[PDB]
Design a protein around this ligand. Structure first.
Ligand SMILES: O=C1Nc2ccc(S(=O)(=O)O)cc2/C1=C1/Nc2ccccc2C1=O
Ligand SMILES: O=C1Nc2ccc(S(=O)(=O)O)cc2/C1=C1/Nc2ccccc2C1=O
Ligand SMILES: *Cc1c(COP(=O)(O)O)cnc(C)c1O
Ligand SMILES: *Cc1c(COP(=O)(O)O)cnc(C)c1O
Lengths: 809, 809
């Protein structure tokens, strides 16, 4: 059908059809008479999977032959989403398969919707890991993703009575055709026990043993025949351990890989979480060292191994590597430490204090007694370095300590990571500067060479070609297909900004995507959106710092203005807000309810009509993002300046033809800088303004007293206008906004609504709104994760990316 | 190589080799460079499995077309063992595969030893279910095996310090290539709740829901292209149900199918067991009725459905069927009851009181409140029948009640089964008579037409062709291959009893099997048996009624006679005793220790030499039975007359060339009757003698006082002769034998040793021992499970067996 989807050869289609029938029969043990749509999806999934194996086997064999430096990306989260379509895209099998299934009388798109999302992530952090894997395979890096195989991923969100309800995400229920169990590579992981000091070294004894069984999932590069591996560990009880009760208690050791903690940017200090963190680290390092010993002086270890810590979650890799090198391999401390620092790199994702991992000492003490001793030794030698560099600065010593004194002693994992890594990076220019100027200023002054920046990116394969083929096609029609793996080329589209044919095409694609989504909204969930309105969307995890509340205030404002002047013309808008709240995050759950409560009033007001609709997108996840984003006109990125480290959803929207309304926060700053401030809807306080407000003190009352419209909104909320049967349902929200708003929603209210008026004004001029859209898409090249990864490879890992096709399949 | 293994066609071998390589590559994602023996076994298993699917699909389609009467065999146990070789044998693929793997440079036998046993059974009861499935497929019956998919089967036994140690049987660890998950057929099962009586009928509400997910395993008939199905249910928690804790508590509902209770002939009244029993029944009946409604007056139900209860474990099927018919389908009681009785049949397996299921009322009351009401109603109407038939016999009423009064009210499941079934059968002639004359005499007098006999059998495919190809070949050389599915033909071998060539062949096969096992004993476990000695073996579960202790006394006697007269000639014997003890069966565990303690003395006595060896076969299971049995010379079947309902190991030994020493118990009686008493080593009390001893009272002291040799043995045990460091280690054993021996070991001691002397005497005459062996093998035809199943089909289920090949694959 469309160019970018590959050729549908005569031989290829014929071969696909027979292998499809082969799997339906031999693999699924079914025949055309009793097969259900799910059986067809599996037949197709196995057929596509067959095309990967050859490449997967020789890619791994290749690395064994040439023995290049290996990159190990440790993360407790990999937000993969679906993999069928992505695999077809990267293998150029999409049209062949579409055609082959067509001839077999099946709609391929209908079959793809059957695939369960691999939601092993919460949000930004987890998705970045996923985009990174794709880019590393595309750039020919010998990389491995390591994590935990949760049998229950992020919970599926249900809205009942306007409230969020959580239900287990049993994504493995029907099976996963992409993973390959490797029980022959099972490794033992130790917990508890105690430390014995013998003649020659310390020993960790009397430990509880849990087995780590690996599951490999192929990660195909874009049309280069490279297939890397994502290895996910599963917890298994040793056969060692009433008889019946003993057998049933095995489900105590295996609970370690049972479920993903659903916290986005929040630290919950539960023991089960620490176990997961150590579990993934202990098993991974053994696998790493084993693979290394094959390639025993570890001086070359850093030249053959790079370990990237995606946040502090896998920070125990630092003391664990030291433990193995010192306790088992018997290297002297200093040598081991040099080695550790040279192979580890740490990526910071947020500056919010409630997100920082600070593990109580009594916990590490009981669970990992040997690691605690190593941590104290590391801390001891590190503070000696600080004291020698800043004699007499005793306060600096307690501020930089890995050990935090107070109510209960805690270990600051972020300080541990900085000390044991040769590189520390932020995820956006502004975020990285903030790290050097505030949160980690003492560390920066001590070792300025460690601090770097690596602005985040998204993969153009899943985030353009896969979810927006229509847009990918009209672009390719003009500049070719080369941009798919070199997004910078999108700049060439800048010379089509005045091209009347292109203007019409870009706008036509957006309209088709909106009709497509508007339909999906009725087919599933039976809604009533009007395709002609401006699609105003904000999708991301529910957070006070993300300020979904600032969006709500604008929605209520728009509503009150319509009711005030009913017969005045206003640009039609469908505001869509979606996202999950962490189960124990009360304020976030109240916000979801407020959103649906506003929709209950606004959507049933006869005077409003189809001029304003408020929809809450249920169960926002990766596969839902692939549908909404391509259909969006306005992208809401309105976090308080200085809180959103980078953000990545913002990039997805810019690449798919939506204009952006936001604050100068995270990557928003670099995006506006690339597209030009005139092509961006910027508003609100900058980082400096927030600081000046804090010096003086933030008093929400002041804004409530001076802005009539804001006052009316707060009064409607307190009087029960949006909750008739429950007059004070939103007392917590009002109370928070008025007395303890850490994110100063009111401070940005006035500039936000005025900026929204500028958006409605531009929308009334179709031609100009589209030319601005083109200006955005054309300058989004910098935000490709290929660029991000190439910088990591060159400035942190010491490896050169390659675009060379691997010697065929 | 050998005839009975099929042809190794040129096309066939070539096709097998390429599909093998296809699976190693595409399925296992490996190449010849990194594949391990386990990968080769899986490649082969998938290759063989591919040959079943075609047949499996059309066999099920066939039944759907013709719609014959369906047989449902409900059992909580299916002792399958390995399935690779059995599948090749039934598909005539054994030589083709042996050859194909040979050309690929692999030893097929080495690969088969890698397969994990499917030990979803304890012993006799579970193995019978397995043999039955094989015979039903071979006789072309539309049969389905229904049970539970335990993720942990019978425990693996380890001997430490002479003691049994149990360790989880994680048989699914590396995966099971034979099963096919059918998550699309998941059914809900209800527990707890309460009963509401509404205008029109009773309702069971507020129940806890557990999901039943089925896994299908193919059951191939012998060379007839029929492939039936064994459906095993797995417990899954509904997605309905702190957030983390809620997700982790799902492993409370799924524990139902976690592990098999390891009790052989013993009732343990734990709630988890009752749950398993209801779980398998509730899910199965829904599947049965659903399949029936397709083929709504249930008058035809009995003509389309037969449900066989393998013991009382699935007895809840009776009140559950009534519940569905009355509460859901709304049929009147009497109609529903007629239907139930006509479709259900019950098989009794033992008369030992400690084995009888008597569920406390308070348990059924809480877990299955509605079933309790149905049971009381059934009981009420049944006792009304008894009273009308025996007016005034009030004692008969309390003896026949399904409800048992006393300390705690209990429900007698055996009485429930007899009342709700149209047929009740024993498993051996003597056992069935005992049921009518004692244990169920009142029921027999009330409905004599319900009581039948169906002597057990073993499948000649797994128990001859598979484990003893050498013997199968020399037999076929003389009478053809027809006997494999018509064992009666073995009688033709009676005319070769004087044939010098056959005598030599039969004896040669036994010798090769012994060398083969003697090697296996050293290769694994490093032992030291002498292939020239008489192989005296007793393998079965450890039980006081099986009397492994009577065997021990003989062993100690033989030892004491050698020490008394060292330079006297005695026939060399290697006595092998093996079997598992239930974890909580203290006496059984003490017996295992006694056995190894005797071996520790006997095996290291210089004066004994290689004249007497005592070995304890570790982890006796189905695959180990396939090795020992073919190598045995003497089969020990020495249970106290009246305790072993039938036994099946006895039949396996008779078919493989071992002579039998035993009591007139169970099927031993029919075996001696078939071979002729002169060709059997019978000894001990008969059932009548045991009763006369009980009338008078059994006083072990009397035997201890009158038999010098027995006295010496008991004194060696009490003085610590066999336990030096622990003088009184065996005080429980001695105490039991002397004061509370329910199985009167001493009463049979004298006749047992004298009979053992007759065995040694015959062994010294190779030619005559072998001619007697031939007489046994030639008359073992009656004990084929094909005969047993044909009788079940004709006299209980109302279906005709067929030997017609199904229309090719
Ligand atoms: O994200 C989260 N997950 C959980 C889980 C459980 C709790 S609990 O209240 O401590 O039980 C709290 C939280 C939680 C939270 N997230 C936030 C974000 C900003 C301010 C306060 C909290 C908070 O308590
Ligand atoms: O086979 C078995 N399994 C178990 C499991 C647990 C127990 S417990 O002693 O009640 O804990 C007892 C048993 C048990 C038993 N089997 C037998 C057979 C003959 C006489 C007494 C017992 C006995 O207690
Ligand atoms: C990209 C993405 C995110 C991150 O969005 P932000 O707006 O940066 O917080 C979260 N969830 C999903 C499913 C995404 O695809
Ligand atoms: C046949 C068999 C049994 C039954 O043996 P009996 O001597 O009748 O008790 C038990 N276990 C296994 C593994 C068997 O194959």
């Amino acid at each position: 059908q469309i160019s970018v989807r590959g050729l549908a050869g005569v031989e290829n289609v014929t071969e696909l059809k027979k292998n499809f029938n082969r799997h339906l029969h031999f693999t699924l043990v079914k025949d055309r008479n009793v097969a259900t749509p799910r059986d067809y999806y599996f037949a197709l999934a196995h057929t596509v999977r067959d095309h990967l194996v050859g490449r997967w086997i020789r890619t791994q064999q290749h690395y064994y032959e040439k023995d290049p430096k290996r990159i190990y990306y440790l993360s407790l989260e990999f937000y993969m989403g679906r993999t069928l379509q992505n695999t077809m895209v990267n293998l150029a099998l999409e049209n062949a398969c579409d055609e082959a299934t067509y001839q077999l009388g099946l709609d391929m798109e209908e079959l793809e919707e059957i695939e369960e999302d691999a939601g092993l992530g919460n949000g930004g952090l987890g998705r970045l890991a996923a985009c990174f894997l794709d880019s590393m395979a595309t750039l020919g890096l010998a990389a491995y993703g390591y994590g935990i195989r949760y049998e229950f991923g992020i919970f599926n969100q249900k809205i009942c009575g306007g409230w969020q309800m959580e239900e287990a995400d049993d994504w493995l229920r029907y099976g996963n055709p992409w993973e390959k169990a490797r029980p022959e590579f099972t490794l033992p992981v130790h917990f508890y026990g105690r430390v014995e000091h013998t003649s020659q070294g310390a020993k960790w004894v009397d430990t509880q043993v849990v087995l780590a069984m690996p599951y490999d999932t192929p990660v195909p590069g874009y049309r280069n025949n490279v297939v890397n591996t994502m290895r996910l560990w599963s917890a298994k009880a040793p056969n060692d351990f009433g008889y019946i009760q003993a057998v049933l208690d095995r489900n105590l050791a295996e609970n370690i890989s049972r479920v993903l903690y659903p916290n986005d940017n929040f630290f919950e200090g539960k023991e089960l979480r620490l176990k997961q963190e150590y579990f993934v680290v202990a098993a991974t390092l053994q696998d790493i060292i084993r693979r290394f010993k094959s390639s025993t002086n570890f001086d070359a270890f850093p030249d053959k191994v790079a370990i990237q810590l995606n946040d502090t979650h896998p920070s125990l890799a630092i003391p664990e590597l030291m433990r193995v090198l010192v306790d088992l391999e018997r290297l002297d401390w200093d040598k081991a430490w040099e080695v550790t620092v040279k192979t580890c790199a740490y990526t910071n994702h947020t500056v919010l204090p409630e997100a920082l991992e600070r593990w109580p000492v009594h916990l590490l003490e009981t669970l990992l007694p040997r690691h605690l001793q190593i941590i104290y030794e590391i801390n001891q030698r590190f503070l000696n370095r600080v004291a020698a560099a800043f004699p007499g600065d005793v306060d600096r010593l307690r501020r930089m300590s890995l050990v935090e004194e107070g109510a209960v002693k805690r270990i600051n994992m972020a300080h541990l990571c900085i000390a044991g890594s040769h590189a520390v990076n932020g995820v956006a220019r502004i975020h990285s500067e903030i790290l050097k100027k505030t949160i980690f200023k003492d560390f920066y002054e001590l070792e300025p060479h460690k601090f770097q920046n690596k602005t985040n990116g998204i993969t153009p394969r899943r985030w353009l070609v896969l979810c927006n083929p229509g847009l990918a096609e009209i672009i390719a029609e003009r500049i070719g297909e080369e941009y798919i793996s070199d997004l910078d080329q999108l700049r060439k589209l800048l010379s089509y900004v005045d091209d009347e044919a292109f203007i019409r095409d870009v706008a036509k694609v957006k309209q088709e995507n909106k009709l497509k989504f508007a339909a999906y909204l009725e087919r599933e969930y039976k809604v009533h959106i009007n395709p002609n309105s401006l699609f105003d969307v904000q999708v991301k995890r529910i957070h006070e710092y993300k300020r979904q509340l600032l969006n709500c205030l604008h929605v209520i404002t728009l509503y009150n203005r319509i009711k005030k002047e009913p017969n005045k013309f206003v640009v039609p808008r469908t505001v869509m807000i979606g996202g999950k709240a962490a189960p124990g995050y009360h304020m976030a759950k109240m916000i979801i309810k407020l959103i649906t409560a506003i929709g209950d009033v606004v959507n049933h007001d006869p005077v409003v009509g189809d001029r304003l609709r408020v929809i809450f997108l249920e169960n926002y996840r990766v596969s839902l993002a692939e549908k909404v984003i391509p259909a969006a006109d306005l992208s809401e990125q309105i976090s308080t300046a200085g809180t959103e480290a980078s953000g990545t959803g913002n990039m997805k929207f810019m690449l798919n033809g939506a204009l952006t309304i936001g604050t100068m926060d995270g990557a928003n700053v670099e995006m506006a800088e690339e597209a030009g401030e005139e092509n961006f809807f910027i508003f609100g306080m900058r980082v400096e303004d927030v600081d000046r407000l804090d010096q003086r003190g933030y008093n929400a009352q002041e804004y409530y007293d001076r802005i009539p419209e804001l006052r009316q909104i707060i009064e409607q909320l307190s009087s029960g206008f949006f909750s008739p049967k429950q007059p004070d349902l939103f007392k917590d929200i009002v109370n928070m906004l008025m007395h303890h708003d850490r994110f100063k929603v009111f401070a940005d209210y006035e500039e936000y609504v005025k900026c929204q008026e500028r958006v409605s004004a531009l929308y009334k001029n179709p031609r100009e709104w589209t030319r601005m859209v083109i200006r955005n898409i054309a300058t989004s090249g910098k935000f490709s994760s290929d660029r991000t990864i190439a910088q990591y490879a060159r400035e942190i890992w010491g490896v050169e990316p390659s675009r060379q096709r691997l010697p065929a399949p």
